[PDB]
């Protein structure tokens, strides 16, 4: 993995200019740090693919473009007149679902539409559970609903009973969806049982954003109380709680190396070593008198005047795509990526034939919609009843 370090006592890691690292880094990554400027349509939600291969931009007015960004390749660029809140890819670059004004639509590789969902009667946040082939939607109505996108079925019409769903986020390790409502409740859900599995109470007021670490072990949340919480998940214990950051945190995103990303409206602030369990690893803003027991943030970047509506890291590169009002920017964050991707599942050099074969392999090995569990290792177990020691018909 890449990294940086001060290697002095004067300069710091956070007051490092993107111009400076774009000068001191190689030409390929300095060329990959793209900055699209799109003005006439609205704020641009950003969704990369599961690998780093493509990019889906949505303007809130009308504008969705699925494009390769490494090579400049227009795949599907369409202005549909109604508003689009968010959108995502499905399993490849070949399909992408856009959450339009009310009806959620899904689209082919070249921009044709394929399904106007009669259900998902509105939508605000989509996600895709990739091993389960489940397109999950939540929004203004209190309905979290799951869609098996392979056979085109519905799976679960889960009633939230908590008003709208302010921010949802997928746990990438046990595939439970963490909704965060207006109550401060971050309730985490599975399509098998209607009652919400586990109702965390993270923040006060509405919860603005949730982001799950890729190891499934930490959950970072921001509320409109100007508060950010780090959560253990496997033990359900509030790790540490940054109170009173000087503006409401709009979005959080955690990279693939445990790297916290907080969007403070016009700011992007990145903390390294913020997902440990100590008291040192609480992310702060100042080393008070030069205190070596703080997390002064790893990097920071103040934008010009534009509200950043969503962060999102690039999977297998050291750069994060942040989406704001007047367009998209990639930010060189040198420790923000798995260098050693595993090419058996997802590959940033994948060609056409292995793309077809990898998707049909996942399509045969799609996990069923029932085994979404709070812990993934509870399938080869025995029942909690029908007691442990077996009896071989001698003492019954």
């Amino acid at each position: 993995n890449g990294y940086l370090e001060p290697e002095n006592e004067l300069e710091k890691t956070f007051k490092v200019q993107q111009s400076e690292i774009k000068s001191s880094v190689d030409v390929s990554t300095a060329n990959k740090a793209l900055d699209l400027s799109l003005k006439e349509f609205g704020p641009y939600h950003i969704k990369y693919a599961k690998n780093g291969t493509h990019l889906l931009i949505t303007g809130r007015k009308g504008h969705v473009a699925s494009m390769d960004w490494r090579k400049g390749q227009l795949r599907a660029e369409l202005f549909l007149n109604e508003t689009c809140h968010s959108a995502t890819y499905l399993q490849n670059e070949q399909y992408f679902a856009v959450a339009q004004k009310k009806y959620t639509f899904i689209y082919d590789h070249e921009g044709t539409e394929l399904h106007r969902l009669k259900q998902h009667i509105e939508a605000r946040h989509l996600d895709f559970l990739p091993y389960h082939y489940l397109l999950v939607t939540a929004g203004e109505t209190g309905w979290l609903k799951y869609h098996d996108v392979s056979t085109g079925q519905l799976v679960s019409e889960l009633r939230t009973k908590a008003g709208p769903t302010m921010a949802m986020a997928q746990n990438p390790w046990n595939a439970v969806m963490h909704l965060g409502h207006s109550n401060g409740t971050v309730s985490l859900w599975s399509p098998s049982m209607p009652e919400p599995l586990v109702k965390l109470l993270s923040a006060r007021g509405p919860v603005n954003s949730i982001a799950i670490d890729r190891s499934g072990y930490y959950m970072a949340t921001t509320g409109a109380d100007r508060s950010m919480k780090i959560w253990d998940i496997r033990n359900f214990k509030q790790l540490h709680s940054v109170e009173s950051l000087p503006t409401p945190g709009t979005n959080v995103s955690i990279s693939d190396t445990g790297l916290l990303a907080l969007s403070r409206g016009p700011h992007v602030t990145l903390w390294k070593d913020a997902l440990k369990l100590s008291g040192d690893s609480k992310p702060c803003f100042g080393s008070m008198g030069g205190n070596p027991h703080r997390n002064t943030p790893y990097m920071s970047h103040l934008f010009a005047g534009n509200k950043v509506e969503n962060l999102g890291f690039v999977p297998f590169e050291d750069l994060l795509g942040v989406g704001h009002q007047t367009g998209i920017t990639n930010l060189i964050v040198p420790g923000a990526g798995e260098a050693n991707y595993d090419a058996l599942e997802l590959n940033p050099f994948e060609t056409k034939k292995q793309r077809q074969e990898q998707e049909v392999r996942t399509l045969l090995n799609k996990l069923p919609a029932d085994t979404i569990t709070l812990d993934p290792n509870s399938i080869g177990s025995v029942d909690k009843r029908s007691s442990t020691i077996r009896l071989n018909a001698k003492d019954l």
């Binding site: 098998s192 049982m193 009652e195 599995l197 586990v198 109702k199 965390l200 109470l201 359900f236 214990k237 509030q238 029932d370 085994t371 569990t373 399938i379 029942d383 909690k384």
Partner: peptide
């Protein structure tokens, strides 16, 4: 009131 509530309905469709 408290931090976390974990309800214990064991699921009869992954029994």
């Amino acid at each position: 009131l408290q931090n976390v509530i974990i309800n214990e309905k064991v699921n009869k469709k992954n029994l």
